[PDB]
Amino acid sequence: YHHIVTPEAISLALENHEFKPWIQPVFCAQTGVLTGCEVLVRWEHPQTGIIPPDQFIPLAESSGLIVIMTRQLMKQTADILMPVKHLLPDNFHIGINVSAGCFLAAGFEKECLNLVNKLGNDKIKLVLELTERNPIPVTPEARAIFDSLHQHNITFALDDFGTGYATYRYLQAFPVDFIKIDKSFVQMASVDEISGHIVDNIVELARKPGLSIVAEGVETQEQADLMIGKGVHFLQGYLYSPPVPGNKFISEWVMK
Amino acid sequence: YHHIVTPEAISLALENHEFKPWIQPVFCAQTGVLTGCEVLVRWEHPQTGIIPPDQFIPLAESSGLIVIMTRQLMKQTADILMPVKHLLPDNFHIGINVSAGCFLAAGFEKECLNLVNKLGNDKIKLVLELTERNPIPVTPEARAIFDSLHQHNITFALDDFGTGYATYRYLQAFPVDFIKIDKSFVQMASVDEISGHIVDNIVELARKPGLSIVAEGVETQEQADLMIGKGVHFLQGYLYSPPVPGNKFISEWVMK
Ligand SMILES: Nc1nc2c(ncn2[C@@H]2O[C@@H]3COP(=O)(O)O[C@H]4[C@@H](O)[C@H](n5cnc6c(=O)[nH]c(N)nc65)O[C@@H]4COP(=O)(O)O[C@H]3[C@H]2O)c(=O)[nH]1
Numbered sequence: 424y425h426h427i428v429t430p431e432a433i434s435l436a437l438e439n440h441e442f443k444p445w446i447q448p449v450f451c452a453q454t455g456v457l458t459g460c461e462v463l464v465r466w467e468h469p470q471t472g473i474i475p476p477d478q479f480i481p482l483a484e485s486s487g488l489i490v491i492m493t494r495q496l497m498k499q500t501a502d503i504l505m506p507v508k509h510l511l512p513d514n515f516h517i518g519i520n521v522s523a524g525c526f527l528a529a530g531f532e533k534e535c536l537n538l539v540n541k542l543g544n545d546k547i548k549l550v551l552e553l554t555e556r557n558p559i560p561v562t563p564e565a566r567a568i569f570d571s572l573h574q575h576n577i578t579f580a581l582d583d584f585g586t587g588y589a590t591y592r593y594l595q596a597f598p599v600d601f602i603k604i605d606k607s608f609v610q611m612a613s614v615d616e617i618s619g620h621i622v623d624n625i626v627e628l629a630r631k632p633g634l635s636i637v638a639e640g641v642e643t644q645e646q647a648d649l650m651i652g653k654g655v656h657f658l659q660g661y662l663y664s665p666p667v668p669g670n671k672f673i674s675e676w677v678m679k
Numbered sequence: 680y681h682h683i684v685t686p687e688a689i690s691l692a693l694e695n696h697e698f699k700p701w702i703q704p705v706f707c708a709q710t711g712v713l714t715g716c717e718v719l720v721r722w723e724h725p726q727t728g729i730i731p732p733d734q735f736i737p738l739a740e741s742s743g744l745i746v747i748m749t750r751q752l753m754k755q756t757a758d759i760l761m762p763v764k765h766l767l768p769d770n771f772h773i774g775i776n777v778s779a780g781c782f783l784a785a786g787f788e789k790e791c792l793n794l795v796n797k798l799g800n801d802k803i804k805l806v807l808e809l810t811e812r813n814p815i816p817v818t819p820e821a822r823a824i825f826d827s828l829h830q831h832n833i834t835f836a837l838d839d840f841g842t843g844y845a846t847y848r849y850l851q852a853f854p855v856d857f858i859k860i861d862k863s864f865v866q867m868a869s870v871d872e873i874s875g876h877i878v879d880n881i882v883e884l885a886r887k888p889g890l891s892i893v894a895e896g897v898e899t900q901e902q903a904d905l906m907i908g909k910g911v912h913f914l915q916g917y918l919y920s921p922p923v924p925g926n927k928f929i930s931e932w933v934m935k
Pocket residue numbers: 447462463464475476477480489493496520521522552582583606639640641642659660661662665666
């Protein structure tokens with residue numbers, strides 16, 4: 424078959440609450456312990472099964488529907504974690520992918536605070552994951568939103584570090600708290616006379632005062648060893664677990 | 680807008696010859712003259728319009744249908760250029776994206792030769808664009824195909840340079856003739872204290888093989904200037920032209 428995703432299809436799916444948060448664990452690189460997670464959206468379409476984000480997020484962004492989607496994902500994430508919030512490790516980080524439209528929408532900050540207040544400000548840390556692809560623009564208006572969120576104890580990550588066109592300029596405007604190295608670099612062989620120099624360079628550029636580095640996309644122990652050896656702070660990847668449904672995240676990570 | 684497609688849908692589209700070669704011009708960095716092109720597939724679906732490769736190539740590759748697709752694209756490319764082959768610049772390069780399945784299929788080399796023989800061996804140069812993503816495996820069998828194609832005056836490019844896990848190893852197994860710097864790096868701002876150091880590093884690593892370098896994805900004169908100044912040999916990008924249909928490529932680039 425040939426299914427076509429249009430704004431009308433996404434909008435109906437939102438009405439039916441078919442966009443679910445799946446969750447991928449994040450770990451301390453030095454101790455191996457659970458420190459957090461990233462929420463990754465999945466469209467659980469009753470007739471066709473699970474549709475991944477690459478087959479709808481870009482249209483959700485250009486149509487504006489992402490705003491409603493992310494609002495639902497944040498409510499649902501809170502609903503999943505509320506019953507086990509007392510079992511989470513202290514300072515448990517929750518990563519939410521935030522596109523430019525979401526960030527700039529009126530009431531965004533109130534939705535962030537609502538998630539934090541449900542789970543416990545003393546307990547979790549909300550991490551808003553931003554990207555240089557189709558980015559938040561550098562305006563005083565955008566920086567004011569960013570600063571207000573920071574003042575309310577919300578933090579930020581930069582996704583896909585090493586792939587952006589003007590990353591220093593971006594970080595100047597949006598001084599985030601975490602740098603997530605793009606998976607492409609995380610998976611490069613240290614011994615390779617080309618690729619080992621690339622990942623070396625990217626990781627060195629990522630070392631900035633106060634910024635914690637997350638190596639995302641770790642698939643093998645040898646990738647993990649390279650990142651650990653470079654003093655990266657957090658690890659995320661298929662080696663540990665792909666993203667899983669809420670209940671499975673609770674059963675396999677919060678409880679283990 | 681997002682098309683969720685099955686092997687059965689691709690196969691029917693191949694039966695209907697709906698996969699068309701679009702063509703993007705490539706230029707000499709020093710003189711600005713037309714030197715070649717890259718063929719980029721477009722699914723011209725009669726009911727829904729033009730579907731880009733990101734919404735079907737990966738399934739074409741995993742299903743095996745890419746083999747038939749590329750065979751069609753090569754025949755069609757020859758059919759487009761045959762009527763104007765005498766008007767092409769001498770040594771006109773034709774870049775064809777070749778996935779692992781295509782490369783390894785019996786009769787691949789004969790399909791390459793058929794294209795070359797139609798357009799003229801002393802006239803064009805067929806360039807097979809390979810990628811480290813889902814790559815040809817490093818086996819004696821694979822290297823024998825690669826060598827035989829080289830002995831028949833066919834050449835190779837490495838796509839997406841700067842993104843592969845073990846690029847030196849890859850080039851040692853598959854000693855290509857051109858390096859294409861990935862667009863992500865070509866578009867980095869030289870003045871950026873992060874991104875300028877990344878593109879600097881990637882371009883210096885791209886010299887290491889001592890091959891011709893193509894900068895793809897050039898969108899601004901400043902990107903072009905950075906690449907020209909670094910001694911890159913060829914330029915390709917929206918600054919000059921996006922990929923266009925065959926007739927338009929002939930009318931706008933081949934002809935004057
Ligand atoms: N091969 C491999 N892949 C790994 C590994 N570890 C993690 N990943 C995948 O890498 C992606 C990480 O998220 P991302 O870079 O922000 O990249 C994300 C993000 O840009 C976007 N996205 C996902 N969820 C959301 C969302 O709720 N909102 C928005 N605006 N974008 C989202 O979709 C992209 C793709 O998401 P997913 O398909 O869920 O793909 C996810 C994740 O499952 C690994 O070890 N190996």
